[PDB]
Each structure stands twice: as structure tokens, then as C-alpha cells.
Amino acid sequence: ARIAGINIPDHKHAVIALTSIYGVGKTRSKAILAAAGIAEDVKISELSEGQIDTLRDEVAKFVVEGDLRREISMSIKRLMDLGCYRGLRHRRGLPVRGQRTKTNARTRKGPRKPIK
Amino acid sequence: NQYYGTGRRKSSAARVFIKPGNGKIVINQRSLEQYFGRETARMVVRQPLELVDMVEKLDLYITVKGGGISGQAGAIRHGITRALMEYDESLRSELRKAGFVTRDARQVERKKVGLRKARRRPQFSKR
Amino acid sequence: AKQSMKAREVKRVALADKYFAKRAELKAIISDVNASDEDRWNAVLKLQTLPRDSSPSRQRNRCRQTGRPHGFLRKFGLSRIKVREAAMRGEIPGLKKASW
Amino acid sequence: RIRIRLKAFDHRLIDQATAEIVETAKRTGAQVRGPIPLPTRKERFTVLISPHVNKDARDQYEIRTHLRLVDIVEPTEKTVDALMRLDLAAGVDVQISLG
Amino acid sequence: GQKVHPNGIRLGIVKPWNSTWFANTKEFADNLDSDFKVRQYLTKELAKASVSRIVIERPAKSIRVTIHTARPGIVIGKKGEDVEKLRKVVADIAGVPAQINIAEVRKPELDAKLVADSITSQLERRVMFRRAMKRAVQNAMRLGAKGIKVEVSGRLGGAEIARTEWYREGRVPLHTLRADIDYNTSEAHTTYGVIGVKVWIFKGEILG
Amino acid sequence: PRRRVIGQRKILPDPKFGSELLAKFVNILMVDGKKSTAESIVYSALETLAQRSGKSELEAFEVALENVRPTVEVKSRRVGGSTYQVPVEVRPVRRNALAMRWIVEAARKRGDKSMALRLANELSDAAENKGTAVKKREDVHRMAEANKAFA
Amino acid sequence: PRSLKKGPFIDLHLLKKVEKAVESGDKKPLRTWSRRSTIFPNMIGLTIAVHNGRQHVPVFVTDEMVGHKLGEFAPTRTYRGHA
RNA sequence: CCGGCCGGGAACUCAAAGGAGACUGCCAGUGAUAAACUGGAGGAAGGUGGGGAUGACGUCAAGUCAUCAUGGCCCUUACGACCAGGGCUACACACGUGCUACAAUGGCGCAUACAAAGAGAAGCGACCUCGCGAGAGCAAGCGGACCUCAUAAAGUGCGUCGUAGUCCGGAUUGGAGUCUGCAACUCGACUCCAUGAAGUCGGAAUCGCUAGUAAUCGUGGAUCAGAAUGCCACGGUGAAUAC
RNA sequence: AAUGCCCCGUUA
Ligand SMILES: [Mg+2]
Ligand SMILES: [Mg+2]
Ligand SMILES: [Mg+2]
Ligand SMILES: [Mg+2]
Ligand SMILES: [Mg+2]
Ligand SMILES: [Mg+2]
Ligand SMILES: [Mg+2]
Ligand SMILES: [Mg+2]
Ligand SMILES: [Mg+2]
Ligand SMILES: [Mg+2]
Ligand SMILES: [Mg+2]
Ligand SMILES: [Mg+2]
Ligand SMILES: [Mg+2]
Ligand SMILES: [Mg+2]
Ligand SMILES: [Mg+2]
Ligand SMILES: [Mg+2]
After folding, report:
1. Which domain holds residue E127?
2. Residues 6+ apart with CB under 8 A from E86
3. Which of E21, E26, E122, F3 gets the highest tally of CB atoms within 10 A of its CB?
4. Which residues are the signal sequence here (chain B) (predicted)?
């Protein structure tokens, strides 16, 4: 099953199959299924092509993988080009929301780097 | 002619009223299978009526408050035992040997300063 | 604490009690969902102009006997140390060492 | 009817005060309900007893506010001004409520 | 420091509360502050009078202050002037009509605070702390206290290394709870710093 | 402990069959106080094992416990200038508890899907003298036999 | 973020100063300490010297910064590297 | 009006308030005719019935001159006082204490049962309406066994997931917002959408606990305009083992 | 019948 320019798990239920898309969570997927008039537990394998076309129309009405890539990249680039606090944090690899950094910032700082 | 009894547990309190009948049960305007949806609760509330074979001779209108399912079950058992005392006055030794008249005083222990709980101390370390 | 800090807190509470009404009605007209945009703008501007010490959120609760800002107890108005010493001396009515 | 709510930190004091109240009531008026005892408040406090640093050393105080309620259902003219003239001990808060 | 306050631990069983009044959370704090200020002013004003204990009770918007002292003739001075001045000033302080009562406490050698203030005056006038403690204990046991302990601490005799001494006579049980333990303390401000003093007086067990 | 020996606390038998042994087994299997879940699991697995191997739940459980039951454990003595791993006999309560513990541990280690299935498979294997439970039993027996030179 | 209904916050003195500056057409560093004020479209083309502790750092206001605050562009903690 | 509702009833839970009771009291044995120990008859509790408070002489010249008080020393157009902003939240790194997880005794959706202990007047804040939501408008009652906070959760029954770094994990990040507060960039909390790191039980070593304890599950309060996974309290389920 | 071990600066 190919949707929004990407394949889709065939054996998984419709909800998780759609969540597999970049830009669609459980709630957005449930809304897609409701708008398409399909059960949340119907496997994509047993589905017909018209339902898949409706799902394509709905995901097109919403935003998709490459669109989100571009939006996020452009936002981060605008930030780090303005040189605001958030852009500085982004470029330096440190947390942005204002977390502590004297310890316990591994998600952004990557693994530990011993001093030598 | 109803015989009354009071049972108590951790935080529960059960009023038991017994009348000679067919042996039906009513807990808070419900049956035991509907109130105590647990086989252990059912067995413990039925215990004394099997200790002394009178499960089918006395109906009873029981009410209970406070505590959880097991606490309420123990309270109902204690109240049923007390009512059986008030009614017969001859099964006292049997229920004593069975261990039913002793009101369980195993109350929940409080939390003390310097401890994570009643007895658990925080993590200790020389360094 | 320092006499300067205590007098500072006194001035804070005095100015708060003074500008309470005006600040209150200004906040009211600002939060008013059925108010004009320009009126709310002017109200926010006047609130800005108003002194900062006039805000009840600016004053810190201090022990009425020593000025200690930490360990304050609203029920008594004293720090924990003074509360304990007064209780032991028998000055706080009804208060006694508890246990259960 | 009139309800009298007494409260105090002293058990014996509140008990003697409500006793005096019910006595004067049965004396002047008649048909006083009774001094029913209500649940008492237990306002607790924990205080670090050390000045600088001891987070495990802590005293635990508590104020016990005992509460009593009495009701008079046949209020005469003299009963009201009598209980109003009556000044009670220090440490007892009395609240009158008609109805 | 481990010992608990005797008055604090006995405040419910045998020993009573000094301040005895009821209040809600809205005025508890200001009531405490007014009581503190009243006690402060009284202790500051009548210091040459052997004031043992100032108790306060505020029933129905009227404060009543009872001063248990040993020199009532002094606290009153000329008959009807000093008490009235104190009543007026304390009423002004509290913002409430004031009433003043005096309680003559016999046997001033049996009060924890009076003995403490006496020792304080002694070792502020440079009397030997040992002699002061010994004579206090002797006077108490002579007047008939079933027990007495008195301890001094800090810069004893202008020493450079502070220490603590204590004299015990009779039977003063503190672990017991029904015992009548009148305990108090004071401090002297000498050229060499501060000297603290504590006094326990065991009158007798109270079987209530 | 040092001072005194203690008295044993009572354990309520199970409602389904009334076996104090099964009550102890479910109390060993439970975790975080979820006795309801433990009872459901043990009852399901026991019914499965029964309909599998014929004889009723009690017979299957007792034969499995007997096949897993040890008789001689090993302890440390540290008498004098030498330390000894002396073998010592086991008492009934101790060996029953050890059997139950080894069985539940083998079930936990087994990489099946459901805990009830794991427990049923382990019980069947033990009844037919298979599984890590009987494995550990044989290991401790061999260790005791090796250290049999101490008494 | 601040409440939408409340509107954007800006200091009265900063607003009056920027009004005077845009009316006068003077291209001078507008010194201020209001790092909390959010930028407005009237500030584009100007240069604001906002306090950052030690001194006032100058920032030239652009369009895409309007929805931001000058504290975002005035850093305070000077860090280079531990070694 | 099927709701103790509202007459009524004072029985019961419950609320205190005062009392009774548990003191080796009695029985048999051991013991040196003792202390005391063992066992049992009663009893709710049997041997300190459980828990708490209560912490001797003194040690560590232990901690606190930044709670407070205080000797001596030190500054007196500043080591005093006021104001704005920033910082106390930084970050190659190491350690301690905790929370969340690695999952199927589980996750998810539906329905549903059982508590205790506490706060409330610059406060708690029903109901109704709007908004997916945080919350917003109106807004009764409550100084409170009466009203609010406030729905307890684990559990139970049904269906699904079927051992997959996954419908586990939720960190990080982007976008739009709510509340407080003059003012949420440095630097609050929370909501919605999307994103979905590491982790697949953890080396040496090491910690807590003997029963309603551990383990687990939630609830409340002090601080507080706003701001806890911490602190202090309450209860539900509820073990194993001690030769 | 006798598997681990060695050390703590100066004055007071
Ligand atoms: Mg933070
Ligand atoms: Mg360690
Ligand atoms: Mg000062
Ligand atoms: Mg209350
Ligand atoms: Mg102590
Ligand atoms: Mg016995
Ligand atoms: Mg400042
Ligand atoms: Mg800090
Ligand atoms: Mg955990
Ligand atoms: Mg609160
Ligand atoms: Mg469930
Ligand atoms: Mg991995
Ligand atoms: Mg999301
Ligand atoms: Mg796995
Ligand atoms: Mg918790
Ligand atoms: Mg050497």
C-alpha cells in the first residue's frame, strides 16, 4: 500500500498503518479514518482501492512527509540565521526549551566525551 | 427478631442483620456476586456459614462502608460471626478455634519523618 | 533580617494596599472580553506605568519577629524556629507536641 | 429554633461551657436539644527544629479544635437576652444562628 | 542538644498554656504578634520587678493580662498609677480594651524564671557562678522543693574556653510526664560575651 | 535471628480447591500485590495442564512438585582454618517452597507468549522430568553428592 | 507564551521612544533595558541597544523578528568552551 | 418522583466525651519454696498487644555569628541605602538522591465497583454554556459532619495488540494556544497537532525491608500570585523468608 | 585445626 509517496504496512490495522506516515499521529489517523468512513481496525490488505484513494485525498488535504521536512528545516534555519537564543542553542547542540545542562542533557549532547 | 452484628477491618465497618430464612444474601442492596466480584471475597464472606452448616437457614441484609473489597469482606465476616454469637451463644468455641472472633487489628502503619514510607529508609552510602 | 529589607517589605505592602483598587479595576477592564482593543491597550499601558511594588505578587512573606523569608507559616506569621520556641514556651494556644 | 456552635482548643473548657449553656436553657426556656459533639479538627504542622541544616530532625505539632453543637427549639423572650448576657470563658468561640 | 522542652511536653497533661484564647486563621497571626509585643513591653518596663509569668486571654474583644510576680507592691508602685498606665499603654498597643491583674507568687525561690534572673543579675554583677548556683539550690531545697537542677554555660569566669557546669539536688525526673517541672532559662550579657542559665524545679508528681 | 524462634503466620487456602500448597504457590507467583492476576494466571495454567495431561489439577501440581523436589541442599560452614560447603538435608516446607520458586523462575525465563502458557509448559515438563527446574534440582543434587565428604 | 487576548506586551517608554525615533528619522542606537518587550513592525530599520548585563548590545531590527523579544537576540551568559 | 426523600425512629455505623478491659490476672510444669521461663482456659487484644512522642553522663573545639541574640575586630560620602537589567537555571565532565521505562502479571478503547485523611474567604469554587483540550463567561453553596476541592487508582468484564525497538518507551524538537503575574527569551506550569532519542533488566560494587512490613496503586496538605518526579501525611491490594 | 596485607606529615 503506497500512500503520500511512501509505502504502508499491509498487515497492521489502519490506524497504526497511517500513523506510520511522517506527520500523522493516532488522533489525526482516527480523524482520517472517520472522514473516509472506514473502521479503525480494518487491515489495509483487505481494503479496496477506492478507500485507498479516499485516504490519499485526505492525507493530501493534510500535510505530508516532504512538506513537514521543508517546514521544520526552514523554521530551524530561520532561527539559527536570526541568531536568537533558540537558534544559538540549535547550532550549538544544546537544549532549547530551557532544561538544565550541567548534567542530564544527553539527548542533545550525544554520548559522553571524556576530557583528554 | 433479626439478630444484629458488627464487623470491622482495616478501615471498614459492616452491619450484619440475620433472619432465619432460605439463605440469600444482600450487600448494599445487591447480591454478593455483584458486589464482591472476587472469588476470594465470596469464599471469605461465606466461610462461617460452612464452618457451621447453616448457609441455607438464614437470610441476611448486610451493609458495609469504608475500606476496599478485602477489608469489607473481612468486616462482613466479622459481623456475621458476631451475629452468630448473638443468635446461638453455643458456637463461640468453634468460631474461636476457627479464628473468626479475633478482630484483625493489623492496621496500616503511618509514615514517619526521615523515611520514604513507614519502614523504608532512603538510599544510604558511605561516599 | 536586615532593617532595610524589612522596611522594603513594609513599603511594598503599603503601596500595594494603596494602589489595590486602581490596579484591580485595570486588570478587570483588561481581562474584559467585551472591552475595546484601544481601551485594553491604554489599560495595559497604565498598569505598566503603575509602580511595580504595588503588586501583591511582589511582597514576600517574612517572619513578623525576625524577618526570615524561608520557613514561613501563614497560620502564625512566624518562622519555624520562632513557632517552635513559642510553642515550647506555651504562647501558641492549643498547640502541643503531637503523636499518633 | 436557634443553633449554638461552640468551638475551642480546650476539651474540658468547651464541655463546661456547653454544660452551662444547656443548664441556663433548661432553666429559663425549655426543650433544649442537647450538646451533640461534632468531629474535631486536627491541624497538623511539621517544623525543622534545627536552625541551619537537619532535614530529618523535625518536630510534629498539632492543634486540636473541639466542636460542639446545641439546639434550642422552644425559644422564649428571656432565653435570648439571657444567653446574650452570659459571658463565657476565654478560649471558646460561640456562634448563634436563628434557623 | 537532645533534651525536649519540659513545658512543651507537659503543656497538655499538667502544665497549662500561658496564652489561652481562641481565634481563626484570619487573626491568629496578628493575635500572636500583639501578644509578643505586649510581653516584650511588659518585660522591658517592669524589669526590676520579680515578674515570673505574663499570661493573656482575649475573650470577646477585651484583653486580660495576668502578671504572676513576686513584688506586687513594686509593680503597682503608688496605689493606682503604674497599673493604670500599663493598662492604658497595653490597650493602645493591642487596639483592644485592656484589663490587668496581679498575682502574688509566694516563695520566689521556687520559680524557675525568678531564680534564673537572680543568677543572671549575680553573674552580671560579677558574683561567682558557683556561689550563685549553690545558694539558689540551697534556698530552694530549704523552702521545700522536692528537686532542683541549675546549669550555667558559656565564658564562666571570663575563661577563653567556654564550658558548662550544672548542680543537681534532690529528685528531678524529666523522662516522667506527670511531674511538676517548672523549667525556665535566662542569659547574662557580660564583658566576655553571653552566659546562659537554665533552671528546673521539681515540685512533685501530679496525679490528676 | 539470634534471640528467639518465631511463630508461623497463617495463609488462607485457595477458594477453587482449598490447597494451602496452591495458596503458597500463588503467593510466590504474585508480584506488587496483584493477587487477583496471580490467581487468574495460576488457575488458567492449572486447568490447561489438567486438560493436557489427564489427571486433575491437584494431581498434576503435586507430581510436578515431587519431580522438582530437592532433598539435600548445600551450605557454608566456615568452622576453622578452612571453609566447607557442607551438604544438609531439607525440610518439607523448605523443599516445597524451593520447588515452587524454581518452577516460577523457569516459567519467567521461558520465552513463550503468555505467563499462563509458560507456567503450564514448565509444569508439564517438570511432570515428565524436563525443564530448568529439574535441571537446577539435579545440579544441586550433584553438588551435594560431590561435597558429600563433609558431615 | 503570553495570553492572546491580553495582546502583546511592550514598555511604554520604549514605545514612546521608538515613536519619536521613527518620526525624527534619526538612525541612532536606541538604548534600553526592556528585554521583555516584544518587537513591533514600527521598529524595523532601527537599531536598538538592549541591556544584557555588562552593557547594551546593539541589534538591527528586521521584519521576521517582529514576533520576538529583544532578549532573544541579546545574550547574557558568555560561554566559549571548557578547554 | 424509589434518592432516607421526608414523616418518623432512636436501635446501628458514625461523632466524640466519660468509663470497663490486659495487670503473668488464673491453671500445669521448670526453677534455688525466688525472680523469671515454657505451654493453655478465658478473652478483641498475653506477656512491652502494634505504632509514636520521650534521647542519661558525655564524645566528635561536629553544624549553625546567613533565624535570632552576642564579646572582640572591621567600613562610616561605604563592607551602609535605593533603582533597572542580568545571574543564582551556565556545561568538555564526575558523584549522590529520585521519577519514568525497557513490557504481554503488559499497552490501548468501552462500561463499572470499593476509601481514608485534609484545605477553603484577596479562598474553595457546583450547575449551565462555549471550546477537542488546557481553560473562558455566567455563577449558586460554603468560615463548612451540610457546599466545593473531588472523578479515586490498581482491580473487575469485554475486544484488540501477539513478543515486532513494537498500538512498550516517552526524551528531543517544530507549529498554535490557556492560566498566573506589571512582565513567561535568559527563566513557570499546562493543553492541542506532529515528531518518536536512548532503553530490550543493566560491570566491579552496593542499598532498604521481618507484616498489614516490603512491593505496587492512587489521594490530600505546607511552601505558593504562578511554579515538584521533592517533603510531610492518608488510605487500597498485599507478599517471601528467618534452620 | 590455623590463605589477604601495609601505612596515617607538624604544632597544640
Ligand atoms: Mg527549569
Ligand atoms: Mg554509593
Ligand atoms: Mg538585625
Ligand atoms: Mg475541615
Ligand atoms: Mg530529640
Ligand atoms: Mg494464651
Ligand atoms: Mg534587582
Ligand atoms: Mg541553587
Ligand atoms: Mg519504580
Ligand atoms: Mg492548596
Ligand atoms: Mg482495566
Ligand atoms: Mg537500541
Ligand atoms: Mg502528540
Ligand atoms: Mg522484548
Ligand atoms: Mg506516591
Ligand atoms: Mg612509609
Report:
1. 107-206
2. E42, E45, E46, E100
3. E21
4. none
